[model samples]
Target chain A: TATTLFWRPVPVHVKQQDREDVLEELTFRILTGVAKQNHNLRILRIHISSDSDLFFLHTLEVSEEDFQSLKNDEGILVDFASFPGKIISLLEKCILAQPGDSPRFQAVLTIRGGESVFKIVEINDFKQLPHITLAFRPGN
Target chain B: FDLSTATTLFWRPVPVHVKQQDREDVLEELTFRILTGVAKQNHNLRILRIHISSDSDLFFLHTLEVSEEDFQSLKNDEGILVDFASFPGKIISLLEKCILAQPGDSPRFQAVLTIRGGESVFKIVEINDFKQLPHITLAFRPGN
Candidate 1:
C-alpha cells in the first residue's frame, strides 16, 4: 500500500534550484511508484505551497510509459521547463508555497480538473524524504 | 462537443470584499475584456460563462467552448493560446479596489486552459488596474 507523501525541508527559493529539485524528485518518486505498481495513474490532487502566504493546485494525466524510462534510466535529465503545463504550474506553485516572512506552518492548496483533483502541502519539519501511496481503482 | 456546451476552465474559492454596487461592473468588464483579448486571435471562440460566487468566501469560475473544427494540419491547429501570467493580473486589477486583502492570502491564481486536453497556465499577483486596451492608453497619452 502506498500513501500520500510530502517532500520536506525543501526551503522556498524564489528562483533557485530547490524548487526544481522538488519537482524532479517528486516526479521521480511518483512515476517510479507508478511503474512499480504497474497501474496507469492520473494525478488526482497536488497540494502545493506558496511563499509564506499562499498555495496552489493543478491536474493532468500521465501513463506508466509517459516518462517511465526515467525510472531506471537515471542518466536522463529532468528539466522542469520541458515538462507539461501541469507539471510546470506545479513547480511554480511550489515556489510560491515556500515559507517566507510570514510565520511558518504547513500549507495546503487544492485544484481540480473535471474528474481529477490535485493538492500541495508544505511540511514544517526539518527533513523528510518524499513518500507516497498508490490507490488502485477497482478497474484501472 | 458543440460550442454551446459549456465547460469549466478553472474554479476556486477566493477571499475578497466586493460590494453589490461594484460587483456587476467588475463581472461584465472582466468578461468583456477576456472575450476581447481571447477572441482577438480567433473569432470562432465563444464565451460560455464568467461568474463570481456570491458567497462570503468569493469564488471565480470562467468557462468557454470552442466552435467545432477539424484537427486539420499542425500548422492550422485549433488550439487557443492564453497568456496566463498576465491574465491573473488583469483580473486582479479589476477587483483590486474592492478586494480586501487578508492575512495568509495567496498572491496568485492558476488555471488549466482546456478540458479533454489540459494545459496549465497561471495568473500572477494583482498590480494596479490599467487601461486594458493599448489603443485607449495611446489615445489618452498627454504626449499624443
Candidate 2:
C-alpha cells in the first residue's frame, strides 16, 4: 500500500533546498496514508509551481499506476519558503465515496489556512485540462 | 523624481481569432513578455500597472489582479463604461501560462513564443485590438 509522489526539489543551491524539503514532508504523509487505506488506488502526478513566487500545487489523477517512483523520508530534507511564507495550501489524498470508472480519486487542497492569502484556480493552458494553481492573495 | 523613463511602449500587434479557436502564436509571445515584466519587478505582489498608449493618443490603462478576474470586469461592476471583452482572453491566459511555464527561481527567463495568426488567414481576419496592443504586467505573491 505505497503510492508514488512527485514534486520539485528545492533550488540547486543548498541554501534553498529547504523549500523543496518542506513540500516533500507533506507529500509523504498524504500518499502514505492513501496507500495504507486503498491498496488499489493508483495516482498520476502533474507538478505545478510558479516562478514569480514559491507556490506549487501538484495536481494528481489517481487512476493509473503510471506515476513517478518518488519517495522521501521526512527529514529536515525540507522546511519551506514562499512569498506569502504561509499559504501554499496542503496537498492531501482523498478516496471518493461513489467510485466507478470516471476518475474518482482526487488530490485535494485545503484552503482553510490560505483562503485569505491565495486561491485555487485552473491554469489556462488550452493544451491541457484544468491544471490548478495556488494563487496568492490581495489578488484579483 | 522623473518617471518618464520608467514607462516603455513597444506597440506590437498580435494576430488571432475570437472563436473557440485560439491563437497559440500570439499566446506564446504575450506570455513571455508578461513573465519578463514580472521577473524584472522581482516580487510576487498581486497588482501590476499596465498602460497601452498609441502615439495617436488612444490609451487604455489596465492591471492584472493576479487573483481576480480582469480589471475591466471590475470597472463594469463599478458602473464604469468600458469594453470588458475587447481585450483578448489570450492576454490573461498568456500571463497564466508564463507563470506556469517558467522554471522555479530562475534568475532570468528567456522564451520565444509563436507570433502570428496561423493557417486560416486568407479567408478570416486576424482579430487584434490595435488599441490594447502594447502594455501589460502581472503576478501573485508576498501578500501584504
Candidate 3:
C-alpha cells in the first residue's frame, strides 16, 4: 500500500459551503490522474477537514497486497521513493481544474516499501497566479 | 523545583488567518500547558496567563491571565485539577469555547506562561496546526 498526504493553508476568501465542493473536485482529479498513470492503483479513502482556523485534505491509496499494513503504521511508511516531476505535474493540473485563487500548497508523498518505509518529497511556496513548480525530494 | 519562588513569563499573541473550512487543522497548532506531577504542592502556580497574537505579528492582542481564585469562583467540579492528565480536557474545552467566541475575522493566537515567583518563564515557539490540538514548548533556563 502507498499513501500520499497533502496540506495547504486555506485561502481567506473561501466560503464555508464551497469547501466540500472543492474537496470533491480535487479528490476526483487525483484519483483519475493516478489511474491514468498507473492502472493497478486503487483508492481507499479521502478525508477532508475544514474550519476557520485550519484547512487540510488528504488522500490514501494502496495496492491489494499491502492492505493489511495500513493498520500497523497509521498508514505511514519510513522510506519510499516518489516521482517528484510526476507529482508536480499532477498538482499543477489539479489546481488548474479548480476555480478561485489557490493558496500555497505543500505535498508530501510516502511510499510503503521500496528501499525504506516512508520517503518524503516537499514542494514548497506554491502560488496560484504564476503557477510555477518548486520540486523537492528527501536527502539521503 | 522550589515552592517558595515561582517564575513568571509573559508572551504576546500572534494572529493567523486560516480558511473557515480548515479550522480543524489549526487545532493542532493550539498551545497547551505542560503540567508537572508536583503541581498540587504550590498555590501561586495555580494562576496562569495565556497570550494570543494577531496576524503573524509578534505582538499580543491580549494576555488572558487566569488565576486559581478564578477557578475557585467558578466552583465547577471539572474546573480545578493539579495535573495535565486530570484537567487537560477541561482546559481544551474552555479554549475551544474561547476561540469560537472570537469574531470570524480575527487572526492569530499565541500562548504564554506566567509563574508567580519569577523563577521560570517559557514561551511556545511553533505548533502543529493540523493535529487534534496544539502542544506548546517551554522556555526554561537551565536548572529552572
What would the per-residue lDDT of candidate 2 be over residues B21-79, giving only the tens digit for each residue? 34222322211112112223433422323322223323312222231245555444322
**DockQ per candidate:** 0.01, 0.02, 0.01
Residues A64-137, candidate 3: write the lDDT tens digits. Answer: 33433532333222222232233344355445434343233323222222211211112212101112222112
Candidate 1, residue A41: the lDDT equals 55
> For model 2, how does the per-residue alpha-carbon lDDT over A1-140 read when each residue is reduced to its tens digit?
44434343222101132233121222211232233356566433233344445554433332333221111111111222121111123221122113342222223233333232212211112111111223222211
Off by over 4 Å in 1: A1-117, A120-140, B1-144
Deviation (Å) of A37 in candidate 2: 9.1
User: After aligning candidate 1 to the native by TM-score, how far in Å is the CA of A137 from where it should be?
Assistant: 8.4
lDDT of 1 by residue, B50-126 (tens): 34333333343333322223112211331212232333343434344224544454332212111121221222122
Using DockQ as the measure, the top candidate is: 2
Candidate 3 regions exceeding 4 Å error are A1-105, A108-113, A116-140, B8-144
Error of 2 at B128 (Å): 26
Model 1, A17-125: lDDT tens digits are 2233233212212221243345455332223233443322222323534345432332223333233333334444555554462212221222222222222322322
Stretches off by above 4 angstroms in model 2 are A3-41, A44-61, A65-131, A134-140, B1-10, B15-144
